[PDB]
Design a protein around this nucleic acid. Structure first.
Ligand SMILES: [Zn+2]
Ligand SMILES: [Zn+2]
Ligand SMILES: [Zn+2]
Ligand SMILES: [Zn+2]
Lengths: 195, 198, 198, 198
DNA sequence: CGGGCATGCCCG
DNA sequence: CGGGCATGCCCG
DNA sequence: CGGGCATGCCCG
DNA sequence: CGGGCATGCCCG
């Protein structure tokens, strides 16, 4: 199977936002709007903002899941490589096999889907803090796109889904990710190549 | 890695809550509480008064335990302990094991627990009701490393969890607060308060 | 942990020889006499000649084992990285964790030493072909020097020993190995680096 | 307390002296030397190249030793060692004792000593003559605590004493220089040199 | 690396 | 924060 | 192959 | 970080 990637802003006008951090060679996380693509370093903080037109109900949850972008790879589960799965860099909460973690949220929940075997990470939705217009989740990606026996230089998309407390769809957005050593260098390269 | 202690306020059947003095924000005040942040700022080894306020009186045998945990969910499963330097300074008061971060001062009935399963440290004293003409019981805590101590807290923020417990360790009430141990509590309190809006 | 790497011709005058090869950028296997170092691609045939002054007894065996060259890594067992171990690329005889295999020899034995945990591969010694001067063994190396989780960019030596049928040592020689994508380029580079010493 | 090695610079009969790299004062330069102060400023664990210059070649078996002492008369008898945090960090190069402040890198012949009488730490290497095309021999030192380290140097300045010694440890030559290990060597050298002037 | 600050001390 | 500095380090 | 790039990572 | 290079892989 393949999880849906279709954008769905939904009744709450769900949108993503990203920080605008530029293309210095080793910027930790930066986002290319031309490419709708986050470029980020392994294990570093990757902020993703949730913007809504109105507040979803209490019990609302926010899930992230990686899939391969290329059609020929889409049915293959995205996992960490054999090396990084064994590095023992757990924060005590995340399963060692999961590519995507959330940092700074003790209510984080990881799922290994019993039917599709896909990995995902979910947290409760919380409204923006006073004086803030969005809710920010800190994600970490735990292998480079280049990892042999893992993503193996294949691009991924992250799919962010807003769900009710039972798992019903409320909203969906997505972005491509490249996890790399020098996000600024690589962003500039793919955009210049775009031009 | 260690399972994570709850930090949720639980007044329980004795209406248990905390109180803190009003000490101001002079640059190097020894201890000061920020109601806005629910955060104590204090100097290493200096007296940190924490008031226990109840509605009904807990039965004799009730104990009051304090434990530190890392605030950041990503360090929360790691035991909070003193740094290698201060563990070796010989500044024990006669009862506190040297690796323990939190001490209680002035109480001969104090006990220190190095837990067998979780390895977490805690310090416990019998609950005593307030003096006649007092509305609360005050415990004097000390924190024996700076938040900045390398190889200890290592600039990571902590929470202190205060639990009311029965003589067997069962939960009766709980409250918590963040703590920064630092050189200039008044200065840092002001900085962090200013950060709320910046 | 570390087996001796000390060159020992022993009573049979045991030496290693190596085929002439170029430094064509991606030549499959090339030996640098200057460096005493083989440069080869992953899973490619690597010829190693065995030379003796006198014939060892029947039942003699030829063993090959990799160790890290650098002294701070010497006690760590050289093995294949987690990815390559799991690639199901075995020849049918080599256990998948073994770095060094022998090609074209059904009398090969692979040993995972129960005491030292080191891997080695052994074949019976067969004297040179009638007329010929040496015996050639074909080795393969199943990870790049670069493999993360495996050699991780650290230089190794291959130690070749002649042993009697009970495992008593008769002779010993060695050579450095880099397993890499472009053995010709890299031999060229390392030889250029040499000349700049100084 | 420990008796105090001489720091008195003298070239002796082989004309022994040190050269430093004049790397300027960029804020975070890894290592830099002030001639006006005779003082090296360097970051923790970074390469500190020290050149050995001689007018004539010393004999086979000549060695070169480095040792730190406190510069301040009131602290001179105290052994200089790493702080408890850094001693316990996972930063070994597989050779240096974890308590030793000064290491040499890039040399398997390095030897570390705790003095039988003074318990003072030193690091020693064989003297090698300059490489072809060079007029000096360069040693790469590393300093493994900051001058500021609590429980270690604790903001007290040190000298490093470099001695040229015969194979028996008799002194052939000596040169000393002040060291500050710090996060911003260029900043702090520029500051200290500013502070010379009226 | 290093601007801008975090965070120690008062013979800092 | 009382003013002034010594002195470490995140993240671009 | 030889030329050149993708992409991790060390130096200051 | 920016400069450079290690080191896999691809292109024509
Ligand atoms: Zn990986
Ligand atoms: Zn401490
Ligand atoms: Zn491999
Ligand atoms: Zn130190």
């Amino acid at each position: 199977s393949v999880p849906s990637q279709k954008t769905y802003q939904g009744s709450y006008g769900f949108r993503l936002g990203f920080l605008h951090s530029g293309t210095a060679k080793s910027v930790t996380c930066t986002y290319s709007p031309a490419l709708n693509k986050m470029f980020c370093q392994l294990a570093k903080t990757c902020p993703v903002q949730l913007w809504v037109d109105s507040t979803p109900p209490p019990g609302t949850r926010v899930r992230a899941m990686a899939i391969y972008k290329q059609s020929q790879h889409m049915t293959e589960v995205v996992r960490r490589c054999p090396h990084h799965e064994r590095c023992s860099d757990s924060d005590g909460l995340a399963p060692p096999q999961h590519l995507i973690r959330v940092e700074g949220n003790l209510r984080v929940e990881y799922l290994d889907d019993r039917n599709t075997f896909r990995h995902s990470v979910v947290v409760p939705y919380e409204p923006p803090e006073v004086g803030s217009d969005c809710t920010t989740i800190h994600y970490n990606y735990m292998c480079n796109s280049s990892c042999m026996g893992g993503m193996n230089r294949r691009p991924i998309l992250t799919i962010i889904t807003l769900e009710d407390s039972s798992g019903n769809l409320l909203g969906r957005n997505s972005f491509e990710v490249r996890v790399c050593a020098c996000p600024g260098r690589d962003r500039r390269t793919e955009e210049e190549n775009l031009r």
